């Protein structure tokens with residue numbers, strides 16, 4: 001049960017700071033699927049440095065277990081975004097676990113060395129235990145860190161045990177970053193951190209792979225509501241640019257968003273970072 005990972009994370013967070021209830025708890029807590037057989041459980045909090053810590057947990061009556069757990073920092077704290085997205089069936093697991101970088105780590109080097117230099121060892125430990133998931137939407141790499149755990153594996157006691165240990169080790173590392181995060185003082189830099197987060201939220205609210213599953217469970221209208229106002233809350237408030245403003249490649253011949261998840265196509269059949277965290281893909 002992924003609920004135990006949520007309990008772990010909330011307990012650990014309250015040893016590094018004090019969580020307060022998010023106002024979203026008044027509008028997003030429990031939601032049944034349309035056929036009433038599956039329950040969506042949602043929690044939301046905030047802290048002095050955390051704009052939104054929220055979780056969605058789904059435990060269906062046929063082996064389906066889903067976890068979407070994220071911590072979004074306030075724009076004054078340029079912390080990575082903690083990201084745990086686990087899609088599990090009775091046999092299969094499709095897993096993304098990462099400290100998503102707020103700013104670009106592809107071309108520039110300052111942000112990458114600021115947050116990930118001391119974490120390469122952690123990424124190396126679990127990249128051996130949870131192998132690269134294979135080819136994936138190329139545009140998604142723009143948001144992944146050198147220590148990302150992208151993996152597919154069949155269910156087993158051993159594999160889920162490794163997954164639990166990875167979540168806990170990665171979340172404790174993120175909390176250690178939070179300890180050291182000092183508030184930004186430059187006003188324009190705060191704006192830059194805010195646009196970077198809004199851009200992140202705009203990508204995922206439009207293209208995150210789990211949206212199809214949510215729409216099947218609770219219908220198009222409520223799914224879009226949960227996506228834009230809970231899971232990626234901030235797409236409406238942190239900026240005015242649209243998805244097509246950030247990613248004009250997706251503008252279709254009709255002026256709408258291209259139905260394709262990936263304009264480039266899926267690539268990177270092998271992990272595109274080496275054992276030292278240098279991008280090689």
Ligand SMILES: C=CC1=C(C)/C(=C/c2[nH]c(/C=C3N=C(/C=C4\NC(=O)C(C)=C4C=C)C(C)=C\3CCC(=O)O)c(CCC(=O)O)c2C)NC1=O
Pocket residue numbers: 066067068083085086087094096135136137139140143144204208209210211213214261266
């Ligand atoms: C920057 C952010 C980021 C994240 C976290 C993410 C995860 C992610 N989920 C995937 C599959 C998948 N994910 C899901 C389902 C779910 N998945 C969930 O994370 C949840 C909460 C559900 C359920 C409601 C399913 C069903 C598949 C396989 C089918 C498909 O690929 O559409 C894939 C492989 C497919 C691809 O390459 O597109 C990735 C990279 N990708 C990103 O770009």
Ligand SMILES: [Cl-]
Pocket residue numbers: none
């Ligand atoms: Cl697939």
Ligand SMILES: [Mg+2]
Pocket residue numbers: 015
């Ligand atoms: Mg402790």
Ligand SMILES: [Mg+2]
Pocket residue numbers: 032033034035036
């Ligand atoms: Mg109902």
